[PDB]
Design a protein around this ligand. Structure first.
Ligand SMILES: *C[C@H](Cc1ccccc1)C(=O)O
Ligand SMILES: [Zn+2]
Length: 307
């Protein structure tokens, strides 16, 4: 409505509603947050990032992106809630004020604008981008199989109509390239988190290879504590481990590419639930879900600022 304070956070919103909300949030807290357009989607929709910052140099940053798979509605909704929480706790929660006084947070609420819009008017279960320009009748690419980390290897499909089709070449999707260029140009991101649904899992690299990352013992300990934190509010249980060891071999994922850029704290959360609702989580589960990942995400940020 006419305030983020009167915005309903326990209901699923449309693309316009989410873009509207960003403008109101900035309008209310211009000192702490600004909106940045990092590119345009296949269909020409602007792609935005909300940058939270108290100021400073090319400060160490924390990247978070939600909704790369459009049907996972619990994610873009969680992002909306996260944005408001960042403005509420600054100046209030000790640990969070510490992180924001030394680091910036970049939050991409609707990473896949076209697919999201499509889930609101055409197919609620659409999860890919909406790119065409190919030798097929089927459209789109699975934006989480499109990164340059083991691209084209076992773990993604080469079938255009496939829901996990990887695309013509690594980073062919503008939605993927928009993030890569922004993160690389910056050259100072210390954490890269991707948020999906469902199956309640905290993942770290890799997905495209059995090789164990050198930072495994640490990232494993970071995941272990993050899972314990999250579980504390309602008892929601997550399993954690490498992508390949605990979900499946998946190539061309964002966290493997990011970790390969040298961004150490690379993780992906697969939110609620484990299958009863899957993608159609009840609106009543939004704030509760948002509340708990906040604990697991804050743990990871705490580790990054301190380690
Ligand atoms: C979230 C789920 C598993 C995953 C995570 C990170 C990289 C690749 C795959 C997915 O299918 O996107
Ligand atoms: Zn997903």
């Amino acid at each position: 409505a006419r305030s983020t304070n009167t915005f309903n956070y326990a209901t699923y919103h449309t693309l316009d509603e989410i873009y509207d909300f960003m403008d109101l949030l900035v309008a209310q807290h211009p000192e702490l947050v600004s909106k940045l357009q990092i590119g345009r989607s296949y269909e020409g929709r602007p792609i935005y990032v909300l940058k939270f910052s108290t100021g400073g140099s090319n400060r160490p940053a924390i990247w978070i992106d939600l909704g790369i798979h459009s049907r996972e509605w619990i994610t873009q909704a969680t992002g909306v809630w996260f944005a408001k929480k960042f403005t509420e706790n600054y100046g209030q929660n000790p640990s969070f004020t510490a992180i924001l006084d030394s680091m910036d947070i970049f939050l991409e609420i609707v990473t896949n604008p076209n697919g999201f819009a499509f889930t609101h008017s055409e197919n609620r279960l659409w999860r890919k981008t909406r790119s065409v320009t190919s030798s097929s009748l089927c459209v789109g690419v699975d934006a989480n199989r499109n990164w340059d980390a083991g691209f084209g290897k076992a773990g993604a499909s080469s079938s255009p109509c496939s829901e996990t089709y990887h695309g013509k070449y690594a980073n062919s999707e503008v939605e993927v390239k928009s993030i890569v260029d922004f993160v690389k140009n910056h050259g100072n991101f210390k954490a890269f988190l991707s948020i999906h649904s469902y199956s309640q899992l905290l993942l770290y690299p890799y997905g495209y290879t059995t090789q164990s990352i050198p930072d495994k013992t640490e990232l494993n300990q970071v995941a272990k504590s993050a899972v314990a934190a999250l579980k504390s509010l309602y008892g929601t249980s997550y399993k954690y481990g490498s992508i390949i060891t605990t979900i499946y071999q998946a190539s061309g994922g964002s966290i493997d590419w990011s970790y390969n850029q040298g961004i150490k704290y690379s993780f992906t959360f697969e939110l609620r639930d484990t299958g009863r609702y899957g993608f159609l989580l009840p609106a009543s589960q939004i704030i509760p879900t948002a509340q708990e990942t906040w604990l697991g995400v804050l743990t990871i940020m705490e580790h990054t600022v301190n380690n």
